[PDB]
Design a binder for these strands. Structure first.
Ligand SMILES: [K+]
Ligand SMILES: [K+]
Ligand SMILES: [Mg+2]
Ligand SMILES: [Mg+2]
Length: 135
RNA sequence: ACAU
DNA sequence: CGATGT
């Protein structure tokens, strides 16, 4: 129904899918960019979406913030819930870096706790998520 | 079908 | 139009 403005919003941006993947997190109320991941040469949209949420979890935990996270990715929200990124991307030399980060993100989820609500951004009702890359 |  | 996902 109502946007929770006191929140963190994350999104992926890519050049190709699979392709170059980046992500960022922003203050939903103001759009202030709070973190930005250096581009990863080969990844999928959903791996980036997943990494972005997990990074948000770690960012908020480190700052003792109870803010929820918005993501527009049904897939990544479920992957974080499951603590398991069920990506189809081939594991080979050129995808090594993204798979390393995904493995480490899962590993972090399996060794830490959090109460952060991970909420679906309702793009159809509210427009594009505030962390969108505008491509 | 829905979410990207 | 193509791809990644439930
Ligand atoms: K975009
Ligand atoms: K499809
Ligand atoms: Mg998105
Ligand atoms: Mg977007």
């Amino acid at each position: 129904e109502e946007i929770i403005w006191e929140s963190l919003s994350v999104d992926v941006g890519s050049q190709g899918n699979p392709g170059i993947v980046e992500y960022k997190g922003v203050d939903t109320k103001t759009g202030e960019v709070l973190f930005e991941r250096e581009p990863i040469p080969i990844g999928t949209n959903n791996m980036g979406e997943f990494l972005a949420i997990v990074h948000g979890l770690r960012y908020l935990k480190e700052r003792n913030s109870r803010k929820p996270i918005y993501s527009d990715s049904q897939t990544a929200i479920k992957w974080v819930k499951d603590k398991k990124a069920k990506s189809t991307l081939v594991r080979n030399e050129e995808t090594a870096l993204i798979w390393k980060l995904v493995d480490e993100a899962e590993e972090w989820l399996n060794t830490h706790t959090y109460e952060t609500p991970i909420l679906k951004w309702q793009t159809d009702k509210w427009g594009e998520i505030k962390a969108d890359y505008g491509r």
